[PDB]
């Protein structure tokens, strides 16, 4: 604040300190799902890793 010097009005204006906040939330569930029949896993998949997991 600010006041004149040698001023007969000698009151001081008090200041204020206000803190703030904001909230972070978990809200989503990302996923990738696959399904393979027994025949598809026996006679169709050669390398499980590079053919299923990596994609």
């Amino acid at each position: 604040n600010r006041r004149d010097l040698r001023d007969p009005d000698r009151t001081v204006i008090a200041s204020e300190l206000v803190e703030h906040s904001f909230g972070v939330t978990l809200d989503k569930h990302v996923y990738a799902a696959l399904k393979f029949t027994d025949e598809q896993r026996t006679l169709d998949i050669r390398d499980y890793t590079k053919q299923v997991l990596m994609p």
Binding site: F36, D38, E39, R41, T42, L43, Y48
Partner: protein, 54 residues
């Protein structure tokens, strides 16, 4: 009676691969044919299920 040459009839067998999601089952033999045994628990029906296939 049947009289046949070796090349008359052909058989082929394949043991199914136990998947990753199933509890590791055993593997039996029926006259030299390898059979896959697989057990799964049905919580909804509160009972065990077994399957032996080829």
């Amino acid at each position: 009676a049947y009289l046949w040459h070796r090349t008359a009839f052909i058989l082929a067998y394949r043991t199914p691969v136990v998947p990753e999601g199933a509890k590791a089952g055993a593997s039996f033999s029926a006259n030299g044919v390898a059979l896959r045994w697989l057990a799964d628990y049905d919580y909804s029906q509160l009972g065990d299920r077994t399957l032996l296939d080829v």
